[PDB]
Design a protein around this ligand. Structure first.
Ligand SMILES: [Cl-]
Ligand SMILES: [Cl-]
Ligand SMILES: [K+]
Ligand SMILES: [Mg+2]
Ligand SMILES: [Mg+2]
Ligand SMILES: [Mg+2]
Ligand SMILES: [Mg+2]
Ligand SMILES: [Mg+2]
Ligand SMILES: [Mg+2]
Ligand SMILES: [Mg+2]
Ligand SMILES: [Mg+2]
Ligand SMILES: [Mg+2]
Ligand SMILES: [Mg+2]
Ligand code: NA
Ligand code: NA
Ligand code: NA
Ligand code: NA
Ligand code: NA
Ligand code: NA
Ligand code: NA
Ligand code: NA
Ligand code: NA
Ligand code: NA
Ligand code: NA
Ligand code: NA
Lengths: 56, 81, 194, 65, 119, 46
RNA sequence: AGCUUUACUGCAGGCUGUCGCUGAG
RNA sequence: CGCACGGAGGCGAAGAACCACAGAUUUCCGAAUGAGAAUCUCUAACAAUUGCUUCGCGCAAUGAGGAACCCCGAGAACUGAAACAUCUCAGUAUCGGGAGGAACAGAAAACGCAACGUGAUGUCGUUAGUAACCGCGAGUGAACGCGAUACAGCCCAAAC
């Protein structure tokens, strides 16, 4: 079985979904945590300094 | 403060339920229950509501098919508006 | 003449001899079985408390905080590290246990602000410090000419910014002359070299 | 227009509610006639009906009902 | 407990407190560990009372030894608020002293005598 | 799949955004829906 | 770069003495 | 009668549009706080942690956001040394916690042009690539003082 095209067929599971807090389709409905804003994990908003160049 | 009845849902299939089953169809606020839809309809047009079926439309609005008692006449209630 | 307080203080100059000694050998037994933060109605070391700002009044709280002894509880490196940074065992934290206690306490009382703290002994594996906190919203305090200063907005979370007494000392701000080139006015302003 | 602010303030707390429920109806009936695609509309008024209701609710709050 | 080396019979504690109440209305009394302490040090103390339910014990530990090396007699009282009440305070008191008794010198004198014998 | 009521309101909305630029907006602006989406070709969130 | 070892240097970990907790005869 | 110049219609001398200030309204999710949930739902709610306390959530506090700046903690490696380990990159990147309109600092157990002298603290110019560090290699690197900016000095603990 190729890891390529043939393994694409079983992909019918729903994970990331429209997030209730930020509106991004990053809410993992199985994890109940947003990969974008962090809703479900952190009260504060997910944000990192590495999302931009150091001097900016 | 939201209202229960938005407006009459007039369409061919809406007309049939009216001319043939004494039913009026409305576009009601989607937070409204059959019971709330019943009252409102009664107090608004002054009729006796026997049964109310709802449905959440692909238009983001809730459609309610209201059936009036044999004492009231759909065609007539509708004609006045 | 000597004040009553002086005796309490004189007793703690040597917490291992005399009555105080026997007292401790007992109290710790119960402390050990208490939590991380235990509010207490009266300061164990009255002189010290009063000395640091304590007052038998409303809005003035006291709590004993327990913190472990020893170096930093550190995880060994999981990636490339030159021999200098491969350390684990001998590394120690830059915040003394007393400042750690002051923080753990203040977090237990989100509305209060840390006024000061003092040591109350330690056994073989832990150290206890009593922290004096203050309710910045109680009028009994907003009207106290000797404490209403702690109510100002800029005194919010003062412990987490090292504005406490043990905080400033630990930041190496004690000396006003030699040795404080890299410490005053701020560690971070001096490029973290202090 | 047809309903000015003065006229609304002259009304009694019971007359405002009266005018309110009255208006709402002229509105609901207007929407229905539009729901039927009824051309005998007058778009400038279904618009007015909304503002009138707004003005009245606004005065009710002001007047303490 | 740490600063208590002898138990005073309930009855004795009753007489003593009694004597204290009359000491406030006749002669003079000092209310509070600091004020008490100074009497013992200034000598102006005939009989000093120390509560047994004090926590921290630090606050009072010194009274006994101090008193001894000052001849000032001292007695124990179970309840803290009982000594405070006798002394005439709404609040309780860790310790108080009879600064010059009054129409109690007889009894007080005996209490002191009763305690010494009680070792 | 079983859609919830909110999921529906959204799907609903997405469907309406999928209409053309009314004939009159053309004349009114003296002369393109950049958010047109095909069911098959494109892909909605969720 | 991955891997090896009686390559160089270090870091965990294990064993062991000592100090503190820690006291009576 | 928004961008937006159509069609129909409407509003304005009862002074509209438009602008300034103040106010009304302000769905649901959201720190999100009655409980649960991909923005919906189930049967009165400061959830949770605190202070005060009429010990009753009765009165209050915290939470989260913000362009960076600020403070307290955790803390690399590429690289430089023409290899490399101390050193260097660098207390940088990145991470944890938190304040304000600015922060921090601050009225000497100072300085030590050693004096018959200076006089809280930041900061700017200089002192100076000086002193000091360093496989004494490569590199690293102040301060007192001075000229300026701005100026401000006080409160407890205890004795009684
Ligand atoms: Cl704090
Ligand atoms: Cl000088
Ligand atoms: K290196
Ligand atoms: Mg693969
Ligand atoms: Mg159904
Ligand atoms: Mg600064
Ligand atoms: Mg369609
Ligand atoms: Mg290699
Ligand atoms: Mg909830
Ligand atoms: Mg190199
Ligand atoms: Mg070399
Ligand atoms: Mg350096
Ligand atoms: Mg110097
Ligand atoms: Na509709
Ligand atoms: Na706090
Ligand atoms: Na340093
Ligand atoms: Na699709
Ligand atoms: Na390899
Ligand atoms: Na608004
Ligand atoms: Na609150
Ligand atoms: Na309460
Ligand atoms: Na090189
Ligand atoms: Na190399
Ligand atoms: Na070196
Ligand atoms: Na000079």
């Amino acid at each position: 079985t190729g890891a390529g095209t043939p393994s694409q067929g079983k992909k019918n599971t729903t994970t990331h979904t429209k997030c209730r807090r930020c509106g991004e389709k990053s809410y993992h409905t199985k994890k109940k945590v947003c990969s974008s804003c962090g809703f479900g994990k952190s009260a504060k908003r997910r944000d990192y300094e590495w999302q931009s160049k150091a001097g900016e | 403060s939201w209202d229960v009845i938005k407006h009459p849902h007039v369409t061919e299939k809406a007309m049939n339920d009216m001319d043939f089953q004494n039913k009026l169809q409305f576009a009601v606020d989607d937070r409204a229950s059959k019971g709330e839809v019943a009252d409102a309809v009664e107090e608004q047009y002054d009729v006796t509501v026997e049964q109310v079926n709802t449905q959440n439309t692909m238009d983001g609005e809730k459609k309610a098919v209201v059936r009036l008692s044999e004492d009231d006449d759909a065609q007539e209630v509708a004609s006045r508006i | 003449a000597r004040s009553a307080y002086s005796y309490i203080r004189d007793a703690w100059e040597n917490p291992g001899d005399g009555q105080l000694a026997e007292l401790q050998w007992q109290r710790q037994q119960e402390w050990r079985n208490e939590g991380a933060v235990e509010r207490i109605e009266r300061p164990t070391r009255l002189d010290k408390a009063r000395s640091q700002g304590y007052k038998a009044k409303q809005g003035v709280i006291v709590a004993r905080v327990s913190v472990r002894k020893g170096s930093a509880r550190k995880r060994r490196h999981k990636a490339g590290r030159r021999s200098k940074r491969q350390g684990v065992t001998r590394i120690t934290r830059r915040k003394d246990i007393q400042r750690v206690a002051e923080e753990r306490a203040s977090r237990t009382f989100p509305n209060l602000r840390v006024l000061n703290s003092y040591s109350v002994g330690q056994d073989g594996r832990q150290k206890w410090h009593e922290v004096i906190l203050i309710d910045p919203n109680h009028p009994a305090i907003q009207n106290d000419d000797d404490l209403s200063w702690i109510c100002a907005d800029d005194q919010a979370d003062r412990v987490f910014r090292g504005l406490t007494g043990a905080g400033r000392r630990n930041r190496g701000l004690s000396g006003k002359g030699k040795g404080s080139e890299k410490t005053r006015p701020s560690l971070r302003s001096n490029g973290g070299k202090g | 227009t047809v309903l000015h602010v003065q006229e609304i303030r002259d009304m009694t707390p019971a007359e405002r509610e009266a005018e309110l429920d009255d208006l709402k109806t002229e509105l609901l009936n207007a929407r229905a006639v539009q729901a039927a695609g009824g051309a005998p509309e007058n778009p400038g008024r279904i618009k007015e009906l909304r503002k009138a209701i707004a003005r009245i609710k606004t005065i009710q709050g002001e007047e303490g009902d | 407990p740490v600063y208590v080396d002898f138990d005073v019979p309930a009855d004795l504690e009753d007489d003593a407190l009694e004597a204290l109440e009359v000491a406030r209305d006749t002669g003079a009394v000092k209310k509070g560990t600091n004020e008490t302490t100074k009497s013992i040090e200034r000598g102006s103390a005939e009989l000093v009372f120390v509560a047994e339910d004090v926590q921290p014990e630090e606050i009072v530990m010194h009274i006994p030894e101090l008193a001894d090396e000052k001849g000032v007699p001292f007695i124990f009282v179970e309840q803290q608020d009982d000594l405070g009440h006798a002394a005439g305070l709404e609040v309780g008191s860790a310790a108080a002293a009879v600064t010059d008794a009054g129409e109690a010198d007889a009894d007080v004198e005996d209490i002191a005598d009763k305690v010494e014998e009680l070792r | 799949g079983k859609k919830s009521k909110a999921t529906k309101k959204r799907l609903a909305k997405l469907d309406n955004q999928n209409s053309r630029v009314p004939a009159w907006v053309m004349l009114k602006t003296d002369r393109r829906n950049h958010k047109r989406r095909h069911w098959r070709r494109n892909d909605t969130d969720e």
